[PDB]
Amino acid sequence: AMLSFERKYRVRGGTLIGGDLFDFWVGPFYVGFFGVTGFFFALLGVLLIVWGATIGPNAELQTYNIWQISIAPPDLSYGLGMAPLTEGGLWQIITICAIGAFVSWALREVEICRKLGIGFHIPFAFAFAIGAYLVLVVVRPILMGAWGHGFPYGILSHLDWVSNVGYQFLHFHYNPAHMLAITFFFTNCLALSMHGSLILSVTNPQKGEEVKTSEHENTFFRDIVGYSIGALAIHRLGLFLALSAVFWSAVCIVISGPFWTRGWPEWWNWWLELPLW
Amino acid sequence: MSAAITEYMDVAQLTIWAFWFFFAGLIIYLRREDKREGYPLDSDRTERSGGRVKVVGFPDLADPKTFVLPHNAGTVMAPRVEAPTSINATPVAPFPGAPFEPNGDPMLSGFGPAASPDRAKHCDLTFEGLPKIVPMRVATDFSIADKDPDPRGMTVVGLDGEVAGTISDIWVDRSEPQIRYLEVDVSATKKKVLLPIGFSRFDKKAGKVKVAAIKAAHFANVPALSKPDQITLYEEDKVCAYYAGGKLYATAERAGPLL
Amino acid sequence: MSPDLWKIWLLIDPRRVLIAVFAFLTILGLAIHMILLSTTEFNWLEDGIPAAKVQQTPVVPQR
Amino acid sequence: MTGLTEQEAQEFHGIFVQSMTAFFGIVVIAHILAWLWRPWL
Amino acid sequence: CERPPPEVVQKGYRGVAMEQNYNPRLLEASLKQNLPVESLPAAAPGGPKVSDVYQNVQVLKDLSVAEFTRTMVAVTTWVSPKEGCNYCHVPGNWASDDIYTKVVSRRMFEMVRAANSDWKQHVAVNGTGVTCYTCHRGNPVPKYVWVTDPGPNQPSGVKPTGQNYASSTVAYAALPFDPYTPFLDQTNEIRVIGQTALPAGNTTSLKQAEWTYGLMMQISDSLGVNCTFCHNSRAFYDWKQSTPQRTTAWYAIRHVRDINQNYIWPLNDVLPASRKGPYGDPFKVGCMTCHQGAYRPLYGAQMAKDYPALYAS
Amino acid sequence: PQQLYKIWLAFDPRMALIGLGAFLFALALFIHYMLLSSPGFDWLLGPDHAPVALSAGMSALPAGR
Amino acid sequence: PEYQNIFTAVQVRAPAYPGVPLPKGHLPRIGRPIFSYWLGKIGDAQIGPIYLGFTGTLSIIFGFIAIFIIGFNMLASVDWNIIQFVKHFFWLGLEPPAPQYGLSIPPLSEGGWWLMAGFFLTMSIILWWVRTYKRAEALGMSQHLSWAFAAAIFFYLSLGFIRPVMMGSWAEAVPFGIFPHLDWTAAFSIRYGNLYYNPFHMLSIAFLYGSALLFAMHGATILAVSRFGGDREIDQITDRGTAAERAAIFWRWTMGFNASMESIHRWAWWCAVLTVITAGIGILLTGTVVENWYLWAIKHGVAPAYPEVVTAVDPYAT
Amino acid sequence: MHKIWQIFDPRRTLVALFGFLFVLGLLIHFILLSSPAFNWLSGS
Ligand code: BCL
Numbered sequence A: 001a002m003l004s005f006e007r008k009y010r011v012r013g014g015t016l017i018g019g020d021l022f023d024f025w026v027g028p029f030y031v032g033f034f035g036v037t038g039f040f041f042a043l044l045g046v047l048l049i050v051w052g053a054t055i056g057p058n059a060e061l062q063t064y065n066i067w068q069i070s071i072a073p074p075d076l077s078y079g080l081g082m083a084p085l086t087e088g089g090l091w092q093i094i095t096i097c098a099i100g101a102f103v104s105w106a107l108r109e110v111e112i113c114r115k116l117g118i119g120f121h122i123p124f125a126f127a128f129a130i131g132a133y134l135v136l137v138v139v140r141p142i143l144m145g146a147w148g149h150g151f152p153y154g155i156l157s158h159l160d161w162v163s164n165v166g167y168q169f170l171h172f173h174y175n176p177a178h179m180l181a182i183t184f185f186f187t188n189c190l191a192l193s194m195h196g197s198l199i200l201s202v203t204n205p206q207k208g209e210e211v212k213t214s215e216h217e218n219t220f221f222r223d224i225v226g227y228s229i230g231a232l233a234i235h236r237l238g239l240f241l242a243l244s245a246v247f248w249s250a251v252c253i254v255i256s257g258p259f260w261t262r263g264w265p266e267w268w269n270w271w272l273e274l275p276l277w
Numbered sequence B: 001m002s003a004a005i006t007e008y009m010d011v012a013q014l015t016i017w018a019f020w021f022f023f024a025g026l027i028i029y030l031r032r033e034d035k036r037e038g039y040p041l042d043s044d045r046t047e048r049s050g051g052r053v054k055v056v057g058f059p060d061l062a063d064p065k066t067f068v069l070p071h072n073a074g075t076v077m078a079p080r081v082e083a084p085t086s087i088n089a090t091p092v093a094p095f096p097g098a099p100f101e102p103n104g105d106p107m108l109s110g111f112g113p114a115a116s117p118d119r120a121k122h123c124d125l126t127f128e129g130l131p132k133i134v135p136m137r138v139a140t141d142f143s144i145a146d147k148d149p150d151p152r153g154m155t156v157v158g159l160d161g162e163v164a165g166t167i168s169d170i171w172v173d174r175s176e177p178q179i180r181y182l183e184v185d186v187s188a189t190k191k192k193v194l195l196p197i198g199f200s201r202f203d204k205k206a207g208k209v210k211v212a213a214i215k216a217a218h219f220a221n222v223p224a225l226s227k228p229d230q231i232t233l234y235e236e237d238k239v240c241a242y243y244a245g246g247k248l249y250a251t252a253e254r255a256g257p258l259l
Numbered sequence C: 001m002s003p004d005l006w007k008i009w010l011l012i013d014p015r016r017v018l019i020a021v022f023a024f025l026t027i028l029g030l031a032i033h034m035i036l037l038s039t040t041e042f043n044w045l046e047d048g049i050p051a052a053k054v055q056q057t058p059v060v061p062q063r
Numbered sequence D: 001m002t003g004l005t006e007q008e009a010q011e012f013h014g015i016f017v018q019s020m021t022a023f024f025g026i027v028v029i030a031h032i033l034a035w036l037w038r039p040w041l
Numbered sequence E: 001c002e003r004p005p006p007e008v009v010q011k012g013y014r015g016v017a018m019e020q021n022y023n024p025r026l027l028e029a030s031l032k033q034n035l036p037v038e039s040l041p042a043a044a045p046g047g048p049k050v051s052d053v054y055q056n057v058q059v060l061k062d063l064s065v066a067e068f069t070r071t072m073v074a075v076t077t078w079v080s081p082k083e084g085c086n087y088c089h090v091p092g093n094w095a096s097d098d099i100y101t102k103v104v105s106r107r108m109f110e111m112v113r114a115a116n117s118d119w120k121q122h123v124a125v126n127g128t129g130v131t132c133y134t135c136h137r138g139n140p141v142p143k144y145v146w147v148t149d150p151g152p153n154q155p156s157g158v159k160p161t162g163q164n165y166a167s168s169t170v171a172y173a174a175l176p177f178d179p180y181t182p183f184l185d186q187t188n189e190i191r192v193i194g195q196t197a198l199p200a201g202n203t204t205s206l207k208q209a210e211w212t213y214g215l216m217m218q219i220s221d222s223l224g225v226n227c228t229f230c231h232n233s234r235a236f237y238d239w240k241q242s243t244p245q246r247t248t249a250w251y252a253i254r255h256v257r258d259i260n261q262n263y264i265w266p267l268n269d270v271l272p273a274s275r276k277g278p279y280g281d282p283f284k285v286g287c288m289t290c291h292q293g294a295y296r297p298l299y300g301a302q303m304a305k306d307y308p309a310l311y312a313s
Numbered sequence F: 001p002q003q004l005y006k007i008w009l010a011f012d013p014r015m016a017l018i019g020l021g022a023f024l025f026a027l028a029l030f031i032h033y034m035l036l037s038s039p040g041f042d043w044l045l046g047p048d049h050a051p052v053a054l055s056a057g058m059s060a061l062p063a064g065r
Numbered sequence G: 001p002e003y004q005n006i007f008t009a010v011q012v013r014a015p016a017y018p019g020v021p022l023p024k025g026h027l028p029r030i031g032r033p034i035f036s037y038w039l040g041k042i043g044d045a046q047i048g049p050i051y052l053g054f055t056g057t058l059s060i061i062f063g064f065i066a067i068f069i070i071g072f073n074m075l076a077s078v079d080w081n082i083i084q085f086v087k088h089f090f091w092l093g094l095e096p097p098a099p100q101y102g103l104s105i106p107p108l109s110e111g112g113w114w115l116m117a118g119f120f121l122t123m124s125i126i127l128w129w130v131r132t133y134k135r136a137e138a139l140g141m142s143q144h145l146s147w148a149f150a151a152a153i154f155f156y157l158s159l160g161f162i163r164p165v166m167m168g169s170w171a172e173a174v175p176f177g178i179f180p181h182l183d184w185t186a187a188f189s190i191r192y193g194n195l196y197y198n199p200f201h202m203l204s205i206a207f208l209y210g211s212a213l214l215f216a217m218h219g220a221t222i223l224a225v226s227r228f229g230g231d232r233e234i235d236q237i238t239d240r241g242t243a244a245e246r247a248a249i250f251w252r253w254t255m256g257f258n259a260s261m262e263s264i265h266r267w268a269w270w271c272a273v274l275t276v277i278t279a280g281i282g283i284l285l286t287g288t289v290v291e292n293w294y295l296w297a298i299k300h301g302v303a304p305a306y307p308e309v310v311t312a313v314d315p316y317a318t
Numbered sequence H: 001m002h003k004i005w006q007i008f009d010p011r012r013t014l015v016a017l018f019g020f021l022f023v024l025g026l027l028i029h030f031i032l033l034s035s036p037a038f039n040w041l042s043g044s
């Protein structure tokens, strides 16, 4: 329900669509109009995933093992048209439901932060992950030419899809945007570990000692590496790294196939064929 | 000493089960740490039961943790008791989960986006015991960076682009050199009010400050300081909350909806 | 062009356009010379003209 | 809105029209030569 | 950089992503480089026999004179069109053998006739066949031969590694750049993956998987395909989940080993020194010598069926 | 429509011209790219586009299920 | 539009801050701090000073020797041609001894230099860990950072030292190079049957994605409430203001549960450390108790099954 | 007609147009170089 200091903040208004029709709370959650739409999109998507598991790929390979349940996209011979329900149209319906649910979630966040009077950084950051998913299942299939290029919905089968797509270019480590995205991911993990460690160390000092001040935080990292970035700038940098990783991963996957159809090492030939050497 | 314990079990399976047990323990620990602020919850279940059933969920709360503050400022318990308050609003509808209406004049109501708790009434201190946020009239060793506007004498305009005063002084932070506040000399009451940087946009071309939170006529109700050289944690929160309330209560079209 | 074209410099300062043009033509010339060096028709060093007078051992025909 | 006088717009418009006309004439001549070299339609 | 869309061929189950992608412009340019040659008209059947008008015929003993001269005319076009017939035959007569080209060609005839009769599980699935033009393409010396690569120069006291150097033989990766010698000439194990879930006496090192990877990069570059043309990448060892082309490749490796060990090496005495590598071995045959970047030589053009002198019987 | 000039009483023209120019340029780029992808309307291939014919039993693409 | 606090509009310059005084028996800090204007638009515009003790000097010496050996071998691999060194720089590497030596010492050109470089680099890393511990303890702070660094060092040593000794050969170790060590990463997966089916690999990937998600959420949250003074996290921890309350309430309304201003930094700490812990185990189980991860997953009913639409005849089974 | 520049600033539009024209020219030249039909360096 409510935290002991929450009742001051449950005010009316700030909705995008609906007004007073859906302006209420359900337990701890705020629903609104987009809450209703997103919840029922998610419910239908879940029920269709369960039915697709019930039907199975055949009558012999059907199983309720959670690692082995997979719902697959259509064939490449259907192009961008609509496939029969049992032959890959269920995947398309579930994809539409998932997109609807994600957009509803983002809009509900926008409503919540309008109500609380805070900035809009959080839905803005969520839009990057939504865009990466959309590149995975919408932009790349259209550029390639068929819905069959999307990945299957299964816990272990989409790993098989990733592996085979990676080996279609004979060596995926030599993709340059892939290297940039991996560098950003590793750097983000390092920065998060350091931020957590420093805050906990300052807040929980040695025994029989008082809480440390803001000067200690800067002095520590100036004495380790000779530079300190600050309290606000560490959060700036964390957001920047986490979003750059996703942006460059989307770039790396959208150029594989649509814009390059050979092995990835060969792409570096422009460097090796310069007249300098 | 081999890799097969039985006909079906092996080492790499026992290792994953041990990891799952450790992970369950870690999740319980983290959720218990999460519950040091705002619990036990305030719900209908407690008040119907006459203050008998306390809503904490699972897991329950931890034993109190002690923070000791520097310069003999005192001691604070991480899980503590706080006095229940009477809000300045009134429910829109009697069913549970209904919103509240900000009774009175919404800007001067202390409810909704214009709400804040009551923090300690003492100034934040440096490593030597000085006040932390002070105007540049006492932090004389500070200076404005080169090739920068120096926003003294800039006119401040309200939400509707109407001038509401001029900047008189800049409040900076001794421990970390950066600007935390602007001082506006309102030309409607002959008073001076503080303005957080997070609510002001620097138009460096024409030398202006844009305040999109409240209108020009609203600069006459900003909460004031006790002394003209330092600020306390209470007053800073009050000043920020007053401007935050304008993000919803400024105009008739800001309550929504679009359709 | 128009006789009154000289007013253009009342909008653009000489320094920031002189630097840009001088830093631009050099890059363009380098790029064109490299593009010509890349082709087999307009490479003046390896064209075989005039004659070779350089003897050109077992070879590796995989490369 | 832009803080320009009337003549500060008139002279700019006149010189802009003259320069753009000359620039377009150049590219028209270039495209005529290119078409006389190798048609692309 | 390239622009979409590509031409896609699906090979596996939907959602498994076993597909081939081609750039149509690159495909058209590659097609322009692999056209076949229109065959000669059929000979008049009958007349004098070969074994009664010629002396030093050894390989083509069971033909007719018209077919014999037609075959000679065709192989003049396939191998040495610029030089003509004096390239192989000493001027003055035709029965003399005092030149190395005639001996080499006599061995090459047997190699081709063996290829067209003994390895039909490789070169006769669709009846494409093998002719002299498959390798030479009108040149006396084929364009895609290999020798034992010495690699970049090293200091006198430094032991070479054979890797960590950019090379087109492994498609510009930092893998061992000479996979020909241990696999396509000698007979080393290509399999490195174990076939049990738990350890049982499989002590293959991690450095041998890189040699296998280099050979596979060379193979896929020679055929112009990717890995999923023959494999499912979640189990490279599993024949049950592979494609029918993997069996053809398995037989092709043995066919190339046979060609190198039994037809090319014994000729190392009579070939001139300009046909040998720095180690003293001649030019050898690989996957690139016939396919030249296509999944079939000449994309499967059938010109061997018109010449009955290229079959053992 | 008779009194359409009132539409400029609600929308600022200075932003409207920027938006219209940007949208029109984006639409033109998209349509040109779509034509460039299509196999019928591709002028970069040249007026004298002659694809390679297959003389014998040859196929440019391998077979697939 | 509204100020998003992504860049600093107006900067303020105060004199340099030497730092909190150190206790007796410490060397003075070296260097005089200077200010950078463009660096001040995103963070603090002050660089230096630094503290350099004895452990810090030893780390520098050991690490520079190791890096010099690596570079010298990369240069020798192209026969002292500096231009060819620049051309092939990303492809060059120094590589471990051959598999026919086991755990013995080969000649210099055949893996001795690799062993010496690895030893010196490991020594420098250990000394740097000791330096971080000492600097944490000199100011009266706790030792969370040294524990996280210890986890990273554990994964590094599993990757380079412990597993080769368990397998009994140096050829199982990773080379020193840009493209060479990516080749090693690919060959390791190929040799041991599709590392996607290693469950500790799955856990490690989950924790990496979780670290990215947690840092994005925390950064966006703190930037959203920074108009209330939310960036000063210590004050909010010791005296909860509107920033912490609004940050908690946003997430409680969004997903039903929330953390604290103090507690969230614990979620950050454990998520990153568990990324490398589960990594170090995942490769210690590979080749020692599991031979083929795909067959292991089939044995435990994890790998999915597909309809048989393409298949091949086995030439070893005729 | 001579009233656009009251709405649009001239100084920035000059540099914007100058940059846009050069970017477009470079793009068209690169595209033409990538087509074997219109390449003027190796086609002849
Ligand atoms: C053989 C295979 C190749 C390879 C082939 C590929 C292929 C193919 C891909 C990658 C992709 C990635 N690879 Mg790779 N990659 C390889 C080796 C690596 C190695 C390594 C150590 O070797 C690393 C670190 C990586 C790392 C990466 C990342 C850069 C990237 C994945 C992150 C991402 O896309 O976020 C994206 C994040 C999302 C999509 C999250 C979306 C979630 C949204 C918000 C939906 C909500 C979720 C859910 C419904 C909510 C409810 C759930 C519960 C009910 C609560 N690869 C090998 C060499 N790699 C992927 C990529 O770049 O994608 C853009 C990709 O497609």
Ligand SMILES: CC[C@H]1c2cc3[nH]c4c(c3C)C(=O)[C@H](C(=O)OC)c4c3nc(cc4[nH]c(cc(n2)[C@@H]1C)c(C(C)=O)c4C)[C@@H](C)[C@@H]3CCC(=O)OC/C=C(\C)CCC[C@H](C)CCC[C@H](C)CCCC(C)C
Pocket: A038, A041, A042, A043, A045, A046, A094, A095, A097, A098, A101, A102, A105, A122, A123, A125, A126, A128, A129, A152, A153, A154, A155, A158, A242, A243, A246, G209, G212, G213, G216, G217, G220, G254, G255
């Ligand atoms: C872009 C930077 C990183 C990021 C940011 C980010 N994620 C976010 C947010 C932000 C800022 C939120 O505010 C939002 C949130 O609420 O967090 C608590 C969220 C969120 N990120 C989530 C997950 C998530 N983020 C990921 C990644 C990332 N998120 C990036 C690394 C991943 C990865 C890498 O895999 C996952 C799994 C959720 C916990 C949450 C959004 C919840 C949501 O959208 O709920 C609405 C939908 C449902 C409740 C049900 C959907 C119904 C569908 C039918 C489900 C199945 C769809 C699917 C296509 C089929 C199955 C797929 C198979 C692979 C199994």
Ligand SMILES: CC[C@H]1c2cc3[nH]c4c(c3C)C(=O)[C@H](C(=O)OC)c4c3nc(cc4[nH]c(cc(n2)[C@@H]1C)c(C(C)=O)c4C)[C@@H](C)[C@@H]3CCC(=O)OC/C=C(\C)CCC[C@H](C)CCC[C@H](C)CCCC(C)C
Pocket: A186, A187, A189, A190, A193, A194, A224, A225, G059, G060, G061, G062, G063, G064, G067, G124, G125, G128, G129, G132, G145, G146, G148, G149, G152, G272, G273, G275, G276
């Ligand atoms: C929680 C797991 C994550 C993690 C954590 C982590 N890393 C850490 C720490 C922690 C907690 C530290 O405390 C420690 C540190 O100091 O952080 C600031 C560190 C660190 N993590 C580092 C790197 C690093 N971490 C990585 C990853 C990760 N670190 C994980 C994702 C990676 C990856 C993904 O590959 C790298 C590369 C270092 C920057 C630092 C530890 C540095 C160290 O120990 O160095 C010892 C050796 C030397 C200093 C040798 C120097 C010798 C000479 C100075 C060389 C002279 C030549 C010179 C290089 C020429 C070029 C010019 C120079 C001027 C640059």
Ligand SMILES: CC(C)=CCC/C(C)=C/CC/C(C)=C\CC/C(C)=C\CC/C(C)=C/CC/C(C)=C\CC/C(C)=C/CC/C(C)=C/CC1=C(C)C(=O)c2ccccc2C1=O
Pocket: A042, A043, A046, G217, G218, G219, G221, G222, G244, G247, G248, G251, G255, G256, G257, G258, G259, G260, G261, G264, G267
């Ligand atoms: C038996 C039965 C009912 C079966 C049904 C099963 C079915 C069908 C389930 C499907 C239900 C579907 C499809 C939809 C329902 C959706 C509903 C109602 C609820 C789902 C909510 C949801 C998606 C929760 C996911 C949350 C998860 C898993 C991860 C979030 C990331 C994470 C680990 C967060 C933990 C740490 C937290 C709380 C961070 C937030 C947080 C941050 C980031 C701060 O910076 C901060 C700063 C200062 C103070 C506080 C905070 C703070 O709390």
Ligand SMILES: COC(C)(C)C/C=C/C(C)=C/C=C/C(C)=C/C=C/C(C)=C/C=C\C=C(C)\C=C\C=C(C)\C=C\C=C(C)\C=C\CC(C)(C)OC
Pocket: G067, G068, G070, G071, G072, G115, G116, G118, G119, G122, G156, G157, G159, G160, G161, G173, G174, G175, G176, G177, G178, G181
């Ligand atoms: C101007 O610059 C000069 C020329 C001076 C120097 C320049 C050098 C350059 C350009 C260097 C470039 C280096 C690069 C690109 C390095 C890349 C390194 C990478 C990517 C490394 C990645 C992984 C390597 C790992 C994980 C190796 C780990 C090895 C370990 C942990 C081995 C430990 C071995 C031990 C402890 C062995 C002990 C055995 C004994 C003690 C007997 O050995 C003597």
Ligand code: HEC
Pocket: E075, E079, E101, E102, E104, E105, E108, E109, E112, E130, E131, E132, E133, E134, E135, E136, E140, E141, E142, E145, E259, E271, E275, E283, E284, E285, E289
């Ligand atoms: C079809 C029946 C023929 C004929 C008439 C010839 N060849 Fe080949 N050939 C191949 C290779 C790798 C070599 C060695 C490289 C070389 O020596 O140039 C040869 C060599 C010859 C020669 C000798 C040419 C010379 O250098 O003097 C001659 C005269 C010759 N061939 C004739 C490879 C192949 C093939 C690939 C497997 C095939 C098929 C053929 N050759 C077929 C023929």
Ligand SMILES: CCCCCCCCCCCCO[C@@H]1O[C@H](CO)[C@@H](O[C@H]2O[C@H](CO)[C@@H](O)[C@H](O)[C@H]2O)[C@H](O)[C@H]1O
Pocket: B001, B002, B003, B004, B011, B014, B015, B018, E199, E200, E201, G288, G289
């Ligand atoms: C984290 C929870 C862990 C719980 C279990 C703890 C005990 C773990 C013990 C296993 C450690 C690995 O133990 C190692 O296994 C391998 C593989 O079987 C054994 O190898 C041996 O048995 C295998 C299998 O029959 C045969 O190839 C041969 O007999 C021999 O090589 C080694 O002799 C043993 O040293």
